[PDB]
Chains A and B, each alone.
With several copies, the nearest count.
Chain A
Amino acid sequence: SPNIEACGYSDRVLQLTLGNSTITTQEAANSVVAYGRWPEYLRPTEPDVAACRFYTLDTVSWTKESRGWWWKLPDALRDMGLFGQNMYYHYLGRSGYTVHVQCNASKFHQGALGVFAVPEMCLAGDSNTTTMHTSYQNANPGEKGGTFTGFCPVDYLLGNGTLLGNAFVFPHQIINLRTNNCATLVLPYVNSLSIDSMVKHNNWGIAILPLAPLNFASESSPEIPITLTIAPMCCEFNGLRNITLP
């Protein structure tokens, strides 16, 4: 689905400075808009560049035994400065995400990391007569993130009873080491409602699985790292409530 061939190595370093944050992207080109829709404003209180700056989650290590990783939005970003506050200080909140997953390795490492963004990704519990199941905390790992396995999501079933070989129906890009180091995903606000209760309902699910295994030349770095940088796009909330100071 994501059959692209930018250049191969590196050309230009174009840095994305949004407010206080500053990422230096591999380039910037090769970006996939989810369903071809940009995050707009509800057609409220708009905290702009204050609540629209790059927060970077924990960098997880990809090793020969790694089965994968998965996060939840907004959830992950609930412990990030301003956006975190605006999440716990409102009853309403709609905000998009520019998930920019960067992965650096040498011209001696091989593998394929596919980033699948699943809308409303409920995780493993063939309990139709009852989803949610796994407690709020077991369902919300936050910034640290949860992991797939061969609170138990089965990787080949994308952790939801649907073969990963079909996962490609969701918006996604394959970071294939020999190609791009970067992967760009802009997910617009998708929900059954106009605006919603961010603390309860999880709008998105970034899941990074390993398509090809990692193989480093003879002896090198036993493991490489993958970084997730996310940023709230066109964020609005209604309406403050007793700046409930902690």
Chain B
Amino acid sequence: KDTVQLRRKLEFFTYSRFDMELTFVVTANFTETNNGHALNQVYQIMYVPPGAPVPEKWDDYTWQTSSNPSIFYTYGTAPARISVPYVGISNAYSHFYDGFSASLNDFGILAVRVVNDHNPTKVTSKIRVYLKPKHIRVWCPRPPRAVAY
């Protein structure tokens, strides 16, 4: 729902099932204008299955999770990738749900943080997320949403 490109494309149908592949191109750089240094960093990316506790403080127990899948990505290598299969509670993801109880479907939540401790030279990093729906199947075909979202 956040990005348009993928949205309209998915809206051409009413129902769908799709094994979801995610890719994580992680890029960094130093903030402050200083010749400060750093060792290569390791980021932890967490996929949390739909209907679980969403992590707040970077601290808290919910970051250990004996169950939630995680990916430790060392910087400066090929981007990370995990495939979360059809995690729908129904028989298809409802693109346009009619009726009452918007929480469309809930494909989960992603949490990313640095694992390394507090470095004197503060390092910013942007985590780009890519989504290739694979083995996709669709149902009732609606007219395309013409306007702006």
A–B direct touch in complex (beta carbons closer than 8 A)? yes
A-side residues, CB < 8 A to B, are: 35, 118-122, 126-132, 136, 139, 157-158, 161-163, 166-167, 169-170, 190, 192-194, 200-202, 205
Flag whether B128 is at the interface (Cβ < 8 A): no
**CB < 8 Å: which of B140, B147, B149 contacts A190?**
B140
Beyond the given A35-B140, A120-B97, A201-B98, could you list 10 further A-B residue pairs with CB under 8 A, ordered by the A residue number?
A: A118-B142, A120-B94, A130-B102, A158-B143, A162-B144, A162-B145, A166-B143, A190-B139, A192-B93, A192-B97
CA A5 to CA B90, docked complex, whole Å: 34
CA A169 to CA B93, docked complex, whole Å: 20
Q: Are B140 and A132 in contact (CB under 8 A)?
A: no
CA A151 to CA B15, docked complex, whole Å: 25
**CB < 8 Å: which of B1, B14, B99 contacts A200?**
B99
Q: Are A192 and B94 in contact (CB under 8 A)?
A: yes
Flag whether B61 is at the interface (Cβ < 8 A): no
A and B contact pairs by CB, cutoff 8 A, 20 listed: A119-B14, A119-B140, A120-B94, A120-B97, A121-B98, A122-B98, A131-B97, A132-B100, A132-B101, A132-B102, A162-B142, A162-B146, A167-B143, A169-B142, A170-B140, A170-B142, A192-B91, A193-B90, A201-B99, A202-B98
Residues in B whose Cβ lies below 8 Å from that of A129? 102
CA A192 to CA B139, docked complex, whole Å: 10
Residues in B whose Cβ lies below 8 Å from that of A166? 143-144
Residues in A whose Cβ lies below 8 Å from that of B141? 169
Q: Are B99 and A161 in contact (CB under 8 A)?
A: no
B-side residues, CB < 8 A to A, are: 1, 14-15, 90-94, 96-102, 139-147, 149
Q: Are B98 and A128 in contact (CB under 8 A)?
A: no
**CB < 8 Å: which of B14, B91, B96, B145 contacts A193?**
B91
